[PDB]
Amino acid sequence: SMLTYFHPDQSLHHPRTYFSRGRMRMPQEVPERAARLVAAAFAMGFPVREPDDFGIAPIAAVHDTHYLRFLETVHREWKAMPEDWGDEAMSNIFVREPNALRGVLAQAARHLADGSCPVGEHTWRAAYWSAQSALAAAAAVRDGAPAAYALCRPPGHHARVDAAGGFCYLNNAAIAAQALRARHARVAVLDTDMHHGQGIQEIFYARRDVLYVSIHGDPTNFYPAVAGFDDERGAGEGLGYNVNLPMPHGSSEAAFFERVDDALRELRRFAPDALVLSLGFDVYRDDPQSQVAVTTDGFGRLGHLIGALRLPTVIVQEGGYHIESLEANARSFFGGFGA
Amino acid sequence: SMLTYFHPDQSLHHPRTYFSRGRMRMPQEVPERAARLVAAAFAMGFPVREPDDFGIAPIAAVHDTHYLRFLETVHREWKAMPEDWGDEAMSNIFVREPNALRGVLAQAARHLADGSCPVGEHTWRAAYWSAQSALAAAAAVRDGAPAAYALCRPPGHHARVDAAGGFCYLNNAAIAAQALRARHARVAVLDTDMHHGQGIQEIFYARRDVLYVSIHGDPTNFYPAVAGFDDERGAGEGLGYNVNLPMPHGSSEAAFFERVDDALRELRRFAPDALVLSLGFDVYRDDPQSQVAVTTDGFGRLGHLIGALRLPTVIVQEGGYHIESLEANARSFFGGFGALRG
Ligand SMILES: [K+]
Numbered sequence: 001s002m003l004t005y006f007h008p009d010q011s012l013h014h015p016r017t018y019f020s021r022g023r024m025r026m027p028q029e030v031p032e033r034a035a036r037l038v039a040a041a042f043a044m045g046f047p048v049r050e051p052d053d054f055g056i057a058p059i060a061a062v063h064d065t066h067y068l069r070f071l072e073t074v075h076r077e078w079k080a081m082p083e084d085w086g087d088e089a090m091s092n093i094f095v096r097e098p099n100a101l102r103g104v105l106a107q108a109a110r111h112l113a114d115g116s117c118p119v120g121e122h123t124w125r126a127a128y129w130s131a132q133s134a135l136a137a138a139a140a141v142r143d144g145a146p147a148a149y150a151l152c153r154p155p156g157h158h159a160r161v162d163a164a165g166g167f168c169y170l171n172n173a174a175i176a177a178q179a180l181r182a183r184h185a186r187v188a189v190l191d192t193d194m195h196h197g198q199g200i201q202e203i204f205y206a207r208r209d210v211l212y213v214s215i216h217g218d219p220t221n222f223y224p225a226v227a228g229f230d231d232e233r234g235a236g237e238g239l240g241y242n243v244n245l246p247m248p249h250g251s252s253e254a255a256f257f258e259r260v261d262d263a264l265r266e267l268r269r270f271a272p273d274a275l276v277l278s279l280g281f282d283v284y285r286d287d288p289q290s291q292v293a294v295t296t297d298g299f300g301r302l303g304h305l306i307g308a309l310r311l312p313t314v315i316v317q318e319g320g321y322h323i324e325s326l327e328a329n330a331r332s333f334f335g336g337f338g339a
Numbered sequence: 340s341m342l343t344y345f346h347p348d349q350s351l352h353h354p355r356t357y358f359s360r361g362r363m364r365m366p367q368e369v370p371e372r373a374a375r376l377v378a379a380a381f382a383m384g385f386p387v388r389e390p391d392d393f394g395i396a397p398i399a400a401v402h403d404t405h406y407l408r409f410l411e412t413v414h415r416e417w418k419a420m421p422e423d424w425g426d427e428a429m430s431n432i433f434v435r436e437p438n439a440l441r442g443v444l445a446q447a448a449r450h451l452a453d454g455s456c457p458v459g460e461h462t463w464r465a466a467y468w469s470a471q472s473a474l475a476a477a478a479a480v481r482d483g484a485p486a487a488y489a490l491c492r493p494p495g496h497h498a499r500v501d502a503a504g505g506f507c508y509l510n511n512a513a514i515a516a517q518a519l520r521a522r523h524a525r526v527a528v529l530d531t532d533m534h535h536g537q538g539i540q541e542i543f544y545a546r547r548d549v550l551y552v553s554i555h556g557d558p559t560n561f562y563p564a565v566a567g568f569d570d571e572r573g574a575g576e577g578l579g580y581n582v583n584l585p586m587p588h589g590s591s592e593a594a595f596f597e598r599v600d601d602a603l604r605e606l607r608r609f610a611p612d613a614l615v616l617s618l619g620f621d622v623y624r625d626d627p628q629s630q631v632a633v634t635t636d637g638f639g640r641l642g643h644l645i646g647a648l649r650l651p652t653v654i655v656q657e658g659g660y661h662i663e664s665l666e667a668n669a670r671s672f673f674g675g676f677g678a679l680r681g
């Protein structure tokens with residue numbers, strides 16, 4: 001058993017509009033994901049609690065405040081434009097700079113980094129409370145709990161210092177790592193979600209107080225497409241403290257646990273005082289976003305390998321979109337973590 | 340009587356997919372636009388000619404060759420991806436940098452700057468030859484003609500050094516300004532299209548040999564959105580040689596002609612040896628994209644004021660999407676333009 005944090009306002013976010021790979025697409029990051037995960041927590045006896053409100057400052061500790069202002073007001077500003085612009089803020093102008101940042105359209109152009117981060121009426125509210133779950137889990141562990149589960153939804157690891165992306169708005173995991181830093185000198189973030197966490201990579205790129213390690217599918221024509229390659233090793237004093245571990249599309253379960261063995265070598269050498277685990281079930285064989293053949297039992301083995309580290313660990317929910325397997329995969333993972 | 344250049348391969352580009360302001364939208368930059376302007380040209384006794392092939396060098400004089408190779412190959416590399424991706428290359432990852440440029444998706448992220456520049460089977464060809472029409476008109480002027488009309492389509496002025504955008508792939512006006520620099524020490528580019536020519540601006544931003552002056556709608560919540568504000572005046576030696584003349588949304592025709600007046604004052608102070616006119620008919624008051632109340636006879640007033648400069652002038656077609664008034668608006672423009680010439 002460990003504390004699991006989830007706020008019901010997290011279910012309110014449900015936008016309809018996603019642009020990807022030439023066409024508009026069906027939403028995959030839906031409220032039902034959190035319903036299945038809560039069911040799994042219940043079946044394992046975990047207490048599921050509402051996080052306290054830690055306020056904006058710990059979010060601002062990671063994200064640029066002009067981005068957070070944008071995020072908070074964009075739906076209201078988008079609603080004041082013609083009915084014809086629709087109900088969800090999205091960017092159709094793909095320019096960070098040069099950029100005057102005058103008007104909501106120019107602001108979307110800077111602060112929404114792909115066609116997968118629509119901002120609806122309840123998006124900021126849901127995103128805010130998903131970050132608070134991360135913070136609550138981080139607080140619990142900071143104060144002495146060996147582990148807690150942040151049941152984050154919307155997910156976070158694609159959110160950059162000043163831009164949303166890939167169904168993410170606020171980088172829950174990075175926010176949790178920065179909270180742990182108040183007490184621990186060395187924090188590691190390990191991300192095993194199917195996709196590279198380009199947001200987490202960017203936030204800590206020039207730093208060595210937080211290690212980042214990611215196992216993910218080869219980003220050649222695969223989200224996030226422009227980062228995640230193995231020659232991205234950090235900058236300045238962060239050089240040597242960012243490790244990308246990509247896998248060929250169509251990899252075996254074995255190849256994934258090879259990458260987990262690389263990750264465990266990097267962690268041993270860094271010797272972290274605390275761990276944030278960005279966990280995704282989209283490595284599952286039947287997840288439609290999957291590029292590796294991880295089985296339900298595989299999640300149990302991953303859970304065991306990380307739990308045996310006996311580090312203070314905040315587990316932060318990221319992706320995984322195959323609704324009917326979420327409960328089984330979560331239960332296998334947490335069963336291995338606790339054995 | 341003015342030489343008009345048009346190549347029929349320009350008519351081949353007809354993409355189906357545009358994404359802007361929250362949704363997929365109907366194509367506005369369609370082949371029929373060329374057909375109406377060619378018929379306008381004829382009806383005024385303009386000789387219409389196909390441009391000779393000036394080759395890739397003058398295009399690559401302005402554009403990055405990574406971007407040019409990408410334009411030429413992207414449709415084929417995109418057809419290699421799953422049929423679910425569709426037939427037209429478009430970006431859904433809005434990141435130019437950092438960008439490792441591995442795979443066609445990352446190449447698109449870098450080289451397609453908005454949801455209005457889809458690349459279909461014949462986009463490269465049409466864009467290539469649209470540029471050749473610009474080069475043919477500039478050549479004719481370079482060699483002694485007093486004016487020439489490049490019937491460009493697709494348009495060009497939103498095309499940056501390294502990226503397509505806004506229905507534009509190759510920056511025709513810029514390509515003509517640079518060619519004219521072969522014979523002329525100072526060239527000016529005047530842009531009266533409804534939208535800010537952010538590509539032309541970028542190309543010449545640190546140069547004082549090519550002035551850029553653009554009249555357009557206030558870019559606050561209006562394409563190109565991120566550029567075209569009046570404090571953008573150039574860099575280095577080109578400080579003072581970039582002039583943006585925005586107008587409030589829903590401006591009167593009187594307001595438009597006040598801005599034309601400001602613009603002519605800048606041209607006089609600069610004293611160009613030759614002029615490139617990026618002309619758009621989307622200031623027309625019933626054009627869907629319009630934010631100013633310009634009438635049909637207003638195009639005549641515009642042509643008259645610009646023709647009275649009596650400068651060697653390459654007229655370069657940019658936008659204008661109201662099909663049923665295109666012929667009447669162009670005829671009025673050209674009829675005003677010749678008035679005080681010769
Ligand atoms: K990952």
Ligand SMILES: [K+]
Pocket residue numbers: 530531532533534535536553554555
């Ligand atoms: K303009």
Ligand SMILES: [Zn+2]
Pocket residue numbers: 193194195280282318319320
């Ligand atoms: Zn993922």
Ligand SMILES: [Zn+2]
Pocket residue numbers: 532533534619621628658659
């Ligand atoms: Zn225009």
